[PDB]
Structure 1
Amino acid sequence: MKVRPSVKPMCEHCKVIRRKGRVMVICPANPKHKQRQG
């Protein structure tokens, strides 16, 4: 995980998804991309 205030997709495959009162970023290709806004 990378937990940052600002969150951006870094690959082309990355997607922006809300799961709870939070904002994920999931990328099946690489794992270094899981970003969760906090």
Structure 2
Amino acid sequence: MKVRPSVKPMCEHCKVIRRKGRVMVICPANPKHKQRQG
């Protein structure tokens, strides 16, 4: 993961998902773009 307070897409395939009181960025394009807010 990368846990940052600020979260943006990185690629064309980044999709923003809320799972709990949180914001995700999930990519099948790379595993390098996993992102948390925290």
TM (normalized to structure 1)? Answer: 0.95
Aligned-pair identity in percent equals 100
Structure 2 gap segments, 5+ residues each: none
Distance in 2, matches of 1:12 and 1:36, equals 18
* Alpha-carbon shift at residue 29 of structure 1 (Å): 1.0
User: Going by fraction, where is strand more abundant, 1 or 2?
Assistant: 2
In structure 1, stretches of 5+ residues that fail to align are: none
Q: Describe the superposition over 1:1-38 as per-residue Cα deviations: whole angstroms up to 9, x where unpaired.
A: 00000000000101000000000000011000000111
Give the total of aligned pairs: 38
TM-score calculated relative to the size of structure 2: 0.95
* Residue 17 in structure 1 maps to residue 10 in structure 2: no
